[PDB]
Amino acid sequence: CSYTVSRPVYSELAFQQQRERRLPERRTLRDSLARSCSCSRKRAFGVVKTLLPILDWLPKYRVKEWLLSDIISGVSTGLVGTLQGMAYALLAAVPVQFGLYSAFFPILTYFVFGTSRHISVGPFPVVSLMVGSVVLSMAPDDHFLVPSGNGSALNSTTLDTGTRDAARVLLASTLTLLVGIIQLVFGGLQIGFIVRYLADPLVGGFTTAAAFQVLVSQLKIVLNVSTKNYNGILSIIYTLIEIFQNIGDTNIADFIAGLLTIIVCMAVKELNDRFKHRIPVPIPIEVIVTIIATAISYGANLEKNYNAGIVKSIPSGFLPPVLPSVGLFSDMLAASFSIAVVAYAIAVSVGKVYATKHDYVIDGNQEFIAFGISNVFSGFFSCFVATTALSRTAVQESTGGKTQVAGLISAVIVMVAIVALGRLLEPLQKSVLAAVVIANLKGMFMQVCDVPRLWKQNKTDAVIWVFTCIMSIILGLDLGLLAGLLFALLTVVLRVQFPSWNGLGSVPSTDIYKSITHYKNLEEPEGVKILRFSSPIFYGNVDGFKKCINSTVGFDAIRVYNKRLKALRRIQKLIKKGPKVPIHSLVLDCGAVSFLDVVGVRSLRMIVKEFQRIDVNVYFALLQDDVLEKMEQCGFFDDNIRKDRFFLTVHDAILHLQNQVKSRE
Amino acid sequence: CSYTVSRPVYSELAFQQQRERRLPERRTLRDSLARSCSCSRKRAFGVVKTLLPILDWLPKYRVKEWLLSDIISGVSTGLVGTLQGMAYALLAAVPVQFGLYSAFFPILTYFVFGTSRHISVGPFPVVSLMVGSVVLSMAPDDHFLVPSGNGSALNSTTLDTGTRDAARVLLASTLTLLVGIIQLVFGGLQIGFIVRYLADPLVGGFTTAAAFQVLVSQLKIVLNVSTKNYNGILSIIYTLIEIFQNIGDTNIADFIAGLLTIIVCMAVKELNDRFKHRIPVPIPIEVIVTIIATAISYGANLEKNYNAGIVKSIPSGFLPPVLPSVGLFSDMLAASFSIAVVAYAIAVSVGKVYATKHDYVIDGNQEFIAFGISNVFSGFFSCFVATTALSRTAVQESTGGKTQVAGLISAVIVMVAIVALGRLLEPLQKSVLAAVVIANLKGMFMQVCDVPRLWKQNKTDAVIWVFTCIMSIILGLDLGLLAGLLFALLTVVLRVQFPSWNGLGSVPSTDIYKSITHYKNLEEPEGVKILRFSSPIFYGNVDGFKKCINSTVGFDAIRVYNKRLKALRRIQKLIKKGPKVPIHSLVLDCGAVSFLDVVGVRSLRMIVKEFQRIDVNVYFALLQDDVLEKMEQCGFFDDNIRKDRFFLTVHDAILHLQNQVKSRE
């Protein structure tokens, strides 16, 4: 209808007199810590239900059809997960059966502490790549070349296949234990705001660069070339150059097989993704391609006749738990922190996606605790860091997944594999397992197509994507994340250091104030100049505010007073012998401020004092209550700078100025 | 008088229809660079006048009366400068004769390019500490112990007094040029916002902890003990213990003489500063205490009889310019960046203090060019980084200083010293020069008295002060600055990640909205709940906004919709066999937002979408123009989320709801 008001001009004190405030809540530290710690059985039951969410979804089961859905999803996800684990085991520089280990214990551990229903905990290409990189950095190949074998001229320093795998597995287990400890520390301390800094473009660029490096590593594995595990600055460029220089030492059979299975898997995946209306259940192309590869590789002796590369080192059994080799935390702390934070970010992303898909709640700290306990339990059985693969997670979602029982059934497949299924997988070529990893990289490789879309959107967020992707390629992958978080924080600081100030004016016959750089037909008060300044004043944008004021008033408050003094000395000597014209007042519409940064309130008081010498009043329009209460403690309201200078709304200041001009000429 | 308005409820589109906007300015990249590069003589005359400000104050000089005030201040600061200049030379591990060079060449260069009038360019105790810090690390004492002197058992690896200074002086000369080049880079590229991050508490806590390290460094010379130049983590802590372990190797002749001049110089300094009404010109106690010290040290043979420490190595002459030893920039790149930024910080700090005293403007970017060429010209004559000592600067201002000519006369006093005055200073004890530095540390030691004052003020700024002081002590002095800059910028991110949200309500019979946690007698609309959120939404505080909205409404928009489906399944099965109570609408008073961070608008659109399922409208109150124009490019105004949802003022959103409920029950 109509918007009409009728009230006197309450600037700061005409509203503060008759209005009674609320007394602040008493701290009472003793009572605060006492009331925080509860003793009733209700809080205990609540924290027990929250810490172990397994007792929640179990009593309300729907076994009738849920059992069949869970068993089919379990067998499907078990096949997919054992394949992905035996594939990713190469990325961690560990034997292939440790991938089956890491596909068994984390699933069991994420059953009594998890809080999700559509998450398949297991390996991940990015995490496996980071683990392999830090293992190669902390345990290179040229550190175990034992001289033996009666060489031609010098000592026969051949490869140390064998005992070196034990050292690599011990290093990976120590890394996993440290990652789990870091996750449990982050969870128990209730600190969850530390992972909010990994923005969507940042994690997107990080996953893109990690997928590119995974493609490089898998191409190195498929081509069957011997590199020098270059790490550090430009590691990916160095290893790509080394691959391009070692093209002659390739294997035609392995390369042809890898290219063929890549083409087949990609074509079948695209066909299944496109024609979803006719086939709801995704065809397990991984399973059939692995079966046919094992069949072909076993019939014809590809190992002997074609000199192919097979595993032929599967022990096909369990092992007793081994205590982790404590003592290498100082040289892997940052790597473990990076691995933990990226794993938790990917886990939270997948959880939120598959939760908003099925409309259920997922707690962050509980997921952190669950993944921490999972990594800790994995460290005691020679496993690497566990996460949720988006490809494997989609399997249980498409085939039908209701509870974690489908995941528990998925562990039964890996269970029967570790003991029995895998002795027949002996003649399987390593290039076959190295191919499905590349085929699963389609999701992260298509993420590059959003950069043109982000450019039409906020450009600062698009630069962060490119900055993260490039920095996570030049200066390694683990250090690239730290270069991305700091760059994002710097971009946030820059957006508040250079605000968007305007020339706010008055709309005729109304009281709403709009910017002058956006609207044309606006009337500003005669002599009065209004200024709006977002991005609250801190120690960095103080000079920015000075420049903004000097630009919006046309002159400089310092130079005007300097010229006044230079003209005054001629006045004081002539009697012995014998700029600030248009501006009348300044209204600062500081309504978009949150903090004040007293280092900045000092400069604000300096500005107000300097404008007093040139007889130009500087008022305030829409300062908040929490801002004025903070400025009061900062020593700003002296005997000269009273509260009448501040106002409540922008139009009240203009009305007061007009009334003062009318009553005082 | 009265504040009354009468206008219809223009929410977003009722105001946008009849209001014509201004067309944005055409970029025209071709014409932009052409219009920027001017060719007229007025623009050419301006850039030359600003680059060389000497042609400004020289033609309008007042030689009649100004020369008298400069000739008395030049001989005054000249004697103070030649003593403080050689005293700070000990902090740079260079001979005492090179300290006189740093008081002659930088003054001459700050005459044709300087832009100030009350600044005495010269050495500085804090800057000289950072210079000598990298000299000890890149050229330690145990790197030149030549075995010679027919020792007792092993090779006589005695001290290398003599050619050892050439290794440190040449290293200091390379540091001076590299610092000067960095200052020219920031000046040439016109980038001056990088020094705005050095806040007052940051530079205050830095100089406080640096002065504490100067006390430890100068006490080493007073006690005449031999340390092991410990550098790195806990550098000051390690060298302090080594001093306490080497108390037995003291010198009572230097200790008594050193402690005596400490009390004398401090007493007269406090006496003259207090009794300013009777004596306007500060008594040069530093000058008289040195002349009387040389007389006593020359009369009685303190060197031979008392085994004191004298210089006795002053060549008293000039030297041809030597080319800098290029090739050590890689090991001094990170160090020079820290020294270059603190030299300019103290320059503007001391500069702006005396600028508002005489009311003259000082160009910030010109100081980078001024000190830039100063250090470059200083590097060609074996000098260290030049700055402005607050103690020496106060001398030329109190004794009477109008222009840089007073500094030019002060250079003549140092000029006659390099040739003649200084051969008589041979028997001067090094403890005397090492004690006058400690006496001037009173100004930086009394800076600790502001921490209780800052605690009553904004506490976050007080923590940065303590954080900078401690970090600049544990992990060195140069690395402590970087730890303070990152911590200060992080505090800005923390202040915007955890905003100050309130429960804004309506004041009766008015239209101004105040917070509910500050005022008592406020009436909120029936069913409507208003929420204000400062610190604009970015990728970090977006999760906090969800908890903020869930806290102000009492419920969770996600759990309520999940409980609806939990109850809907019973409804769809009973027909086959046979929370959100108070909240009516949500008004988000996002009037304190500056940026939008499209990464966050994806969740912002999700918020409006989530509350739509529970039949709870979420409106907007005071969104700015530059923010709504940004959300449009982010893909937010779809066929369902129109512009009618947004409003101009907070009361228009409330008035519209009252009219909508009255017209639609």
B163 shares contact with chain A (CB less than 8 Å): no
* Cβ separation A2–B9 shorter than 8 A: yes
Q: Which of A510, A514, A659 sits opposite B5 (nearest CB)?
A: A510
Where chain B is discontinuous (C–N > 2.5 Å), the residues before each break are: 578
For residue B194, the 8-state DSSP code is: G
In the numeric block, which tokens belong to residue A661? 């001009």
* Cβ separation B20–A540 shorter than 8 A: no
Q: Is the dihedral of CA A61, A67, A72, A77 positive or negative?
A: positive
Residue B519 β-bridge partners: A21
d(CA B414, CA B421): 8
Polymer length in residues for chain B: 665
If phi over 0 gives left and psi between -120 and 50 gives alpha, with beta otherwise, what is residue A615? Answer: left
Max Cα distance, chain B (Å): 121
Q: CA separation (Å) from A652 to A505, A656, A657, B155?
A: 14, 6, 9, 88
Q: Which chain B residues touch A556 with a CB distance below 8 Å? A: 361
β-strands A617-620, A585-589 pairing: parallel
Residue B363 near residue A569 (C-beta atoms within 8 A): no
* Cβ separation A22–B511 shorter than 8 A: no
**CB contacts < 8 Å between A and B, how many?**
248
Sorted by sequence, the CB contacts under 8 Å of residue A566 that are 6+ apart come out as none
* Cβ separation A21–B519 shorter than 8 A: yes
* Cβ separation B652–A3 shorter than 8 A: yes
A166: three-class secondary structure by DSSP: helix
The DSSP element (H or E) to which A22 belongs, if any, is none
Q: Which chain A residues touch B496 with a CB distance below 8 Å? A: 492, 496, 594-595
Q: Which of A4, A593, A633 sits opposite B6 (nearest CB)?
A: A4
d(CA A237, CA A14): 69
B589 shares contact with chain A (CB less than 8 Å): no
Q: Which A positions 76-115 lie with beta carbon below 8 A of chain B?
A: none
A476: three-class secondary structure by DSSP: coil
A553: three-class secondary structure by DSSP: helix
Sorted by sequence, the CB contacts under 8 Å of residue B387 that are 6+ apart come out as B121, B122, B123, B124, B127, B343, B346, B347, B371
What are the φ and ψ backbone dihedral angles of B113, each rounded to 5 degrees? -125, -5
d(CA A301, CA B597): 59
* Cβ separation A515–B626 shorter than 8 A: yes
Q: Which regions of A468-573 does DSSP assign to beta strands (E)?
A: 505-506, 513-514, 528-532
Q: Is A330 exposed, middle or buried (0-12, 13-18, 19+ CB in 10 A)?
A: exposed
CA–centroid distance for B22 within its chain:
40
DSSP per-residue string spanning B258-277: HHHHHHHHHHHHHHHHH-TT
* Cβ separation A493–B488 shorter than 8 A: no
CA angle A43, A49, A51 (to 5 degrees): 100
d(CA B341, CA B103): 21
Taking Cα atoms as reference points, which of B333, B376, B328, B317 lies closest to residue B167?
A: B328
Taking Cα atoms as reference points, which of B536, B286, B579, B324 lies closest to residue B433?
A: B286
B562: closest CA of chain A, how far (Å)? 7
* Cβ separation A9–B15 shorter than 8 A: no
A142 shares contact with chain B (CB less than 8 Å): no
A518 shares contact with chain B (CB less than 8 Å): yes
A360 shares contact with chain B (CB less than 8 Å): yes
B511 shares contact with chain A (CB less than 8 Å): yes
In the numeric block, which tokens belong to residue A205? 């660029």
Q: Is the dihedral of CA B653, B654, B655, B659 positive or negative?
A: positive
Residue A517 near residue A502 (C-beta atoms within 8 A): yes
- CA dihedral angle for residue B481, residue B483, residue B484, residue B489, rounded to 10 degrees: 130
Buried-state track B347-362, b at ≥16 Cβ within 10 A, e below 16:
bbbbbeebbeeeebeb
A626 shares contact with chain B (CB less than 8 Å): yes
* Residue listed under structure tokens 């003020």: B457
Buried-state track A526-552, b at ≥16 Cβ within 10 A, e below 16:
eebbbbbbbbbbbbbbbbbbbebbeeb
In the numeric block, which tokens belong to residue B313? 């190595």
The DSSP element (H or E) to which A8 belongs, if any, is strand A2-8
Q: Which of B197, B492, B514 sits opposite A496 (nearest CB)?
A: B492
In the numeric block, which tokens belong to residue B311? 């210089």
B610 shares contact with chain A (CB less than 8 Å): no
Q: Which of A22, A541, A562 sits opposite B360 (nearest CB)?
A: A562
d(CA A574, CA A567): 11
Polymer length in residues for chain A: 665
- When scoring A597, A602, A651, A660 by the number of chain B Cβ atoms within 10 A, the one with the most, hence best to mutate, is A597
d(CA B338, CA B343): 9
State in Å, rounded, how far the first CA of chain B is from the last one.
39
The count of other CB atoms within 10 Å of the CB of residue A167 is 16
CA angle B593, B599, B601 (to 5 degrees): 55
Residue A207 near residue A350 (C-beta atoms within 8 A): no
Residue B351 near residue B367 (C-beta atoms within 8 A): yes
CA angle A13, A637, B505 (to 5 degrees): 40
The DSSP element (H or E) to which A660 belongs, if any, is helix A650-663
* Cβ separation A520–B20 shorter than 8 A: yes
Q: Which chain B residues touch A493 with a CB distance below 8 Å? A: 489, 492-493
B17: closest CA of chain A, how far (Å)? 12
Sorted by sequence, the CB contacts under 8 Å of residue B269 that are 6+ apart come out as B285, B439, B442
What are the φ and ψ backbone dihedral angles of A528, each rounded to 5 degrees? -85, 140
Q: CA separation (Å) from A661 to A339, A656, B298?
A: 67, 9, 77
Q: Which regions of B108-158 does DSSP assign to beta strands (E)?
A: 121-122
Sorted by sequence, the CB contacts under 8 Å of residue A15 that are 6+ apart come out as A648, B512
Radius of gyration of chain B (CA): 34
Q: Which of B7, B458, B496 sits opposite A596 (nearest CB)?
A: B458
B520: closest CA of chain A, how far (Å)? 6
d(CA B91, CA B125): 8
What are the φ and ψ backbone dihedral angles of A5, each rounded to 5 degrees? -130, 160
Q: Which chain B residues touch A509 with a CB distance below 8 Å? A: 7
d(CA A636, CA A604): 9
Q: Which chain A residues touch B197 with a CB distance below 8 Å? A: 539-540
Residue A89 near residue A95 (C-beta atoms within 8 A): yes
In the numeric block, which tokens belong to residue B603? 């969740």
CA–centroid distance for A38 within its chain:
34
Sorted by sequence, the CB contacts under 8 Å of residue A404 that are 6+ apart come out as A54, A57, A110, A111, A114, A116, A117
Roughly what angle, to the nearest 10 degrees, separates helices B333-358 and B200-223? 110
β-strands A585-589, A528-532 pairing: parallel
For residue B281, the 8-state DSSP code is: S
* Residue listed under structure tokens 């603190």: B342
β-strands A2-8, B2-8 pairing: antiparallel
Q: Is the dihedral of CA B69, B74, B76, B80 positive or negative?
A: positive
Taking Cα atoms as reference points, which of A504, A470, A499 lies closest to residue A487?
A: A470
d(CA B61, CA B402): 10
d(CA A238, CA A420): 41
Residue B510 near residue B548 (C-beta atoms within 8 A): no
B516: closest CA of chain A, how far (Å)? 9
d(CA B602, CA B598): 7
Q: Which B positions 164-203 lie with beta carbon below 8 A of chain A?
A: 193, 196-197, 199-202
B606: closest CA of chain A, how far (Å)? 11
Sorted by sequence, the CB contacts under 8 Å of residue A623 that are 6+ apart come out as A590, A591, A593, A646
Sorted by sequence, the CB contacts under 8 Å of residue A490 that are 6+ apart come out as B489
CA–centroid distance for A94 within its chain:
28
d(CA A501, CA A534): 7
For residue B452, which amino acid is it?
Answer: P
* Cβ separation A199–B599 shorter than 8 A: yes
Sorted by sequence, the CB contacts under 8 Å of residue B272 that are 6+ apart come out as B279, B282, B283, B285
- What's the half-sphere exposure (Cβ side, CA atoms, 13 Å) at B364? 15
Q: Which chain B residues touch A595 with a CB distance below 8 Å? A: 458, 495-496
Q: Which of A19, A193, A201 sits opposite B599 (nearest CB)?
A: A201
Residue A247 near residue A303 (C-beta atoms within 8 A): no
